[PDB]
Amino acid sequence: FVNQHLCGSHLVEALYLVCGERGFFYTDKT
Amino acid sequence: FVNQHLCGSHLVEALYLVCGERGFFYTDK
Amino acid sequence: FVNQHLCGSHLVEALYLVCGERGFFYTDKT
Amino acid sequence: FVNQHLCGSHLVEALYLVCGERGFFYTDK
Amino acid sequence: FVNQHLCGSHLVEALYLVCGERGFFYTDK
Amino acid sequence: FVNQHLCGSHLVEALYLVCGERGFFYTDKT
Amino acid sequence: GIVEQCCTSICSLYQLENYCN
Amino acid sequence: GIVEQCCTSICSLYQLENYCN
Amino acid sequence: GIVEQCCTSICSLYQLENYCN
Amino acid sequence: GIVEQCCTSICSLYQLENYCN
Amino acid sequence: GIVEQCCTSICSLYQLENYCN
Amino acid sequence: GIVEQCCTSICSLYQLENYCN
Ligand SMILES: Cc1cccc(O)c1
């Protein structure tokens, strides 16, 4: 897996693909 | 499989934009 | 809707989704 | 609906790249 | 054509993420 | 074609679309 | 859900907002 | 233009909609 | 148009350039 | 290949890694 | 949160998986 | 490599095509 800043939409896509069937929660900024 | 998987990718990117700081849950099982 | 710099391809995608059936014009830099 | 909608998303990203500073219109109704 | 072409776009973006610095070949003919 | 920094996933997408049926090799950093 | 509503037909940004938060 | 308004500065949705047909 | 030409079959970058500007 | 394996059914990140390098 | 961990700093895959359901 | 040529500097289309098979 990459060693990169995953930000904005890339962060969400990477989540999408990492989590597969589990799905995910995206809080954005905390 | 793939077609709904490919759709899913676009939905999440759309959600990111529309929801902003609110964020969102992505799930259904 | 986000509070972010929408640049390059993200700007065009965001347009695409914001404008729906109307479509849009993308001048790029002016 | 969706399939041509999903295609549309990819067309516009392609257009952004190929057209550059020229830009482009995206419409058809 | 397009459907496998649209899939291809998503595969390569996935590959970019999963492979990282390893990179990858994308081909098949 | 654009005059832009193509980085990360944009670089790979741009490759994908530029190379068409030939395909490509993405070494990432060298 | 979102997939059955938004992958069969087009969901606008207004429709997608329903799924925020 | 859209780049100077929404890329170099940040745009509202309403501001983005100025670029629809 | 672009959708009927480029969503049925693959449009190369050369083909897509027709729609620039 | 990847297209026939991963466009027919979903390839997870684990499956896609097979095609790295 | 995920943004502060993976966007402002860099994340491992394992670190990213903390945000799956 | 492609990153050092097209990401850290800007690339022409011709320069990008060096990375096709
Ligand atoms: C609709 C659906 C099913 C399974 C997993 C998901 O993330 C989404």
Ligand SMILES: Cc1cccc(O)c1
């Ligand atoms: C082809 C098409 C139809 C309607 C709206 C659009 O933006 C594009």
Ligand SMILES: Cc1cccc(O)c1
């Ligand atoms: C599967 C496939 C066929 C032809 C070209 C490609 O880049 C990939």
Ligand SMILES: Cc1cccc(O)c1
């Ligand atoms: C924005 C978007 C993506 C995918 C499907 C849709 O109906 C809408």
Ligand SMILES: Cc1cccc(O)c1
């Ligand atoms: C680049 C691209 C996107 C979508 C459809 C096409 O034919 C070509």
Ligand SMILES: Cc1cccc(O)c1
């Ligand atoms: C990540 C990804 C993209 C496209 C098809 C797949 O099976 C998986």
Ligand SMILES: [Cl-]
């Ligand atoms: Cl970016």
Ligand SMILES: [Cl-]
């Ligand atoms: Cl798609």
Ligand SMILES: [Zn+2]
């Ligand atoms: Zn980006």
Ligand SMILES: [Zn+2]
């Ligand atoms: Zn797609």
